[PDB]
């Protein structure tokens, strides 16, 4: 549980800095003998500004996207400046509350997504396309989501559209064998869209609820991964596009999502290896940047270690 | 040769046949054979088969754009069509497919090379684009020969300036057929060399200028930007994309890339005689909306042959 | 130096001179230069210029100017045609070097609310790191306080070199740990300058992409964070087959305000140096003509023209 | 503790196969009515040979070096063939005992090394050179060994001869700061041997017991990592050369050690991330191939998670 | 086909013929070829052969043989010099193709305790995978049972292709999971062949290093595990600037017993094909002269010589 | 220029001085100044300083072999040496260092180029080895000029067959000084071209053949094997390694690699005038046991200058 340790440390450091400025403000009032007229201080811009400048530095070093750093700064500044604190109250809690609110607001996307609700109301099959670079944990995630879907009453078939990774496909089939879901695949190096469109036809004929599409995570010979993704999305017309990312790649995940998003619009996000994320700045940033909710998080190597995302659990982890 | 594509078009016909058969058996059931002599193909008859054809065609390297256009050209040529109960549906259905494929090979311009040249103010400038290993260099030698045998004078610009090997090869074949090669020093500016060739052609009253271009980015780097610069400077009458037909997994995407930089007027496919798949070759004209002008069906100078849509269709449908 | 450029401009002038003489000797009070006198020479000039790394855009603008100055120009018989033609050409070249805004660095710093923030862009090997040290020295010698941000965070070597030079000339370098966020370091440096009333902050930036993401995006991020007063492209004049394309690329991401060309003194072709300002629409501010600190010289259009013609 | 799971599974499978052949042999005796004359069976070659052929296949797939596969086969064959088993005894235990012995014999190197004993008897400083490719965990290991050495009464200095990795050096110094040991370093890209020779001079003058040399784990521009290692070894004349390897790189660790060994002779081995090794074939093979004992193993991310190697703990892990 | 080789051998013959005629016409019962008659032509032959991909070792051996056959040779006046010289040259070339042991494959299989194990070595693109299928077909057509080990474990594509061809010709392929240990697969295949009384096991191997370790080491490991009856190098005849070096490399790790050259029919230079057997000291066993199964032909020295001379 | 090396040799002298001073102060203590006029340098006086010099020299790019040889040549030139109490030790100590450095520059053969050529049976064949960017090509042009100005006829073989750029450059400079360049087509066999050059020289009675060689592996590939093949075929009288002196982190290791393939007889260092470090330049002759023959101290033809050990020592010790 050194989880989000670096983010937590920088937010903690900000709170302390401001707290100490507020404390000087109180002592000034006490010293000047103003206690016969005033028992509160009003947080001023000079109490926060340097602390805000250093938070910008610290958060950028902690992998927080610039956009999110700016949104956080202004929310906090707006919540604090002019805020009245009575001498002898816990100023730390008042300051931390503003930060916590700002962070919580950062986690809001213009759409929450109830996966089960979305599938139930939809004309079957409900088609989910996965995007992401190799190493993100896409393949395992798809098996785990299949398991979760099945455990919730839905039938599922998987399209192996990662056609050039015979290893990944073999893995995919072993897991799918173990959970009783079918994998549709063609020959090595097959056309990814044909494979997926095939899995869709299979789903229609056998009345399967959900089609999950495993995709490639690198470009093969002359044609962009992004182009291939657009072609799969044109052919399969997904109900939902999920971006998969490795929480440990703090230096790349937001940018990876940005690249995919420009090609095929992301509806939802899944973060793997989150339990091992000792930093947290990227994970905190991604929903905001892509304006898409995090649907699931990987917190272990077991099938039940793919958990639906809960905002409050995430905040608990950041703040303690 | 095109066997794969032909295998797939063949099985689609078979599947539609089986559905039409059930349509007839259905008429049989209601004991209406005594008064109804025809059934009309319904969408329910072609639908699953069309989905299967989409799969099959994508796996055979047919571009998405073309697969979608084919589905609709066919789906609409069959649905509502009346067929005679008891006859062989095979001819009829295959006919519609054959038509759809034929329309797919229609581009918005046809190009009569000799006619375009004669009417044009000399020199007529032709720019070739394409990646290396598609036989661009040899193609340019062959096309030069062809133009001469039709009475045009020709000069070639060696604007593939970083490939000394290719340039040597080019001068050989050019000396062999009595055509001049204009070249500068190693690593010269491609546009400068081609512009130079053009001034020479004006001065000496040459009919045709062929610009041999690079087929890879140099260190500087970008191939597409280099092609843009050459087109800007030389203002080509005609831009021809050269591609190796055996590269079914690439050739269409190659053309798309060049097309975005400099608009392609015509296509030449090499090694087409050896193409036993044909999805890409079938796709390229539609995707780029440019006619295939010649095809390479051998290693002889006279194996670069004017493209005929009809020969192409025959090869497909056997 | 600019030898190749000079040789081809000279042949063009002599080529037209012949046609003009050959028209003075067609009369026999004035002779008029005609289109037929400049065309073939212009076309050959185009070939020659392209071979000397002159950007096409610049080649075309030169054609246009030379043509509008010469065609229809009437000159007295007996006069020196070669010199009149060359003067036209020289005017054309001089206009090519004229940018939509000359820039007085010192004036811009003084009239600006401190700190004046300069962001450098360019690829590695362009002399960026050394150039920043020299510019810092120059700025100090005109009585400005200076601080340098080591935002080239993945090159421990270049940062040591920077710190050594800076120490010599009494300039502080701000740096974080290895591979730090470049925008964070620059922002930090700016907060310091504010706190210390420093006049100038120089931002040293990466010159390659990391196992990470586009150099171009990184530059945009830095620019957003620091809101530079001035953005300066650094380029190596010997890279005639590259620098103009380099600057186009950068200019696309973050608008360039001025150019510094290094190793200019060794440039014996010059087409690229002649082109770069016109193409990016930014003045050349300093040129590097040696390895000494005083070898980063403020740029003079005149000096450049003299090197080109004679 | 899916630790060494794949190796364990293949050895288990071998035991079962032979056990079933022995069981048929017993039933044959019982069936033929020979119980009035014989109450034991003698394991024959035909009882083991196919099982031995499949063990060779299985062990090669489990990353066991060929050399070790051959040694294991012959030891087992020799222990089993002609072995007398009384009907009604536990044949499984008898067969497993032979396998366990063979495996244990495989772990014997012509030298065990008592590190503390070696340092105490030596003219100070005792110089240890580390070799290994990047990603092996060399740098962290050196800090941890420094800690262990210090906790055992020895003073320690570290040479930063990994001169081109400013990141790794910074890490190295943070850890060394935390445990109170000095790091000697020069400028970026400095000569690795000069740095190490410098740390040795420092050690002589201040009477430090141990010098640890952090080395590069990749070739820089034109000159082989192996050449650089030979040059460091010529200059520093180490008392001990330790090869560091990432237990998770089952496909490479034995070969990595082989390459280094040919250049500078390895005295001892350290395996990191062993606790996470779900295979075990390489770890089992390395001592034998290089004829060098494993001195320490990494079983966690804490400083006390670098543990002295014990053969019996290793066998316990393999067999259960 | 072998055109380049033919052209240069022919010019050498004609060059010496002149010197010999020019010596018949110096007498006037016999004329003796002298060193001064062959030297300059030999030196020019050396240049020409090196340019046609003939290995230096082979060029030198040819010099030696041609020289020992011609110098001091006395020929009757009136005789055809060109033909006598050419016969010498032809003998030299023929000896170059003679290896320290011709090999009768069928005989070796029959007289050997089954299974006879063949291990193939070579780099990707040499036609190894296709060649193994064709060799399997050939072996079956002579009444041997065959099984193939898919030890090229990191190429899912090539293994599918293999399995397709093999299925056509009634041959089983043994394979494990993706990226399996190559030696393990081959050993497995051998245990099967034993169990099933199969005559021949063909081992298909990798033709590049993985994110792993040297192809050459992998080949040694496989050879140790399988103790091949025969090791066969496969090479693409069109790779004249590579194949001999390829075989040297392999031969160094695992001794090669024989060679198969593919695409031989398209080879219009031939220097490498002429060289490979002499250099590695192994016979060429089969040549690929087309895409049909019957286009893997047993190799005939005579056939090769006829293609070279006429 | 060589400032780094000079900085380090300078500080070693200073450290030995300080120790010798303590030796004298020690004599002072025992009140023996009245009868003893000299002290002899002991190993305890040079030891720590020699360890420091090892560090300093390694960091300055001095090869290990040379650092070790220097330590011993010095340690043995100083230990046991008597110095005069009260004088300046600086001259004395520096003298020993200067000597050690001088011996380090001694190779087992000296090479008089003109003399070796005159006595040899023509053509005298010289093979150049080295990696690209070390100025091999230009060096060969300059050396050609020099040979001519000393009355030798020269032909050059263009065996750098895959670099059309370099070959053009070479022909220019060669035409400029009236020397012939023998070349074949692009990508020709280097040994064939050089052998060809040699036959030409015999035929036309040329004194000297200079073989321009490749400086990188081609796709085939190996550079060293290619050099072996060329030496085997051409049987060089002399093999010269060319290296850029500014590459202090590489040049010695480059020479080692070539030396292992084909034994180097002499060395030419380019851009030496710009070398402000000098550890590598100081090291190379010893490591390879081959004399530096010429040095490049400028861009002029006459800036390729015969090497003089004495000039070199002066440059170091100022």
Residue numbers in the entry:
A (entry chain B), D (entry chain B): -1 to 318
B (entry chain C), F (entry chain C): 1 to 318
C (entry chain A), E (entry chain A): 1 to 28, 37 to 318
Paper text:
The process is mediated by evolutionarily related signal recognition particles (SRPs) and their cognate membrane-associated receptors (SRs also called FtsYs in Bacteria and Archaea). The core proteins of SRPs and SRs are GTPases that each contain a structurally and functionally conserved NG domain where the G domain adopts a ras-like fold responsible for GTP binding and the N-domain adopts a four α-helix bundle fold. Here we describe the X-ray structures and solution conformations of FtsY, the SR from the hyper-thermophilic archaeon Pyrococcus furiosus (Pfu), in its free and GDP•magnesium-bound forms. The low resolution, solution scattering data complements our high-resolution crystallographic analysis and shows that the crystallographic structure and the average conformation adopted in solution are similar. While the overall architecture of the archeal receptor resembles its previously described bacterial homologues from the SRP/SR GTPases family, the structure of Pfu-FtsY reveals novel features: The elongated N domain lacks the N-terminal extension observed in all other bacterial FtsYs and is instead characterized by a long N-terminal helix αN1 that packs against the NG core in a different way; sequence analysis suggests that archeal receptors may cluster apart from their bacterial homologues.
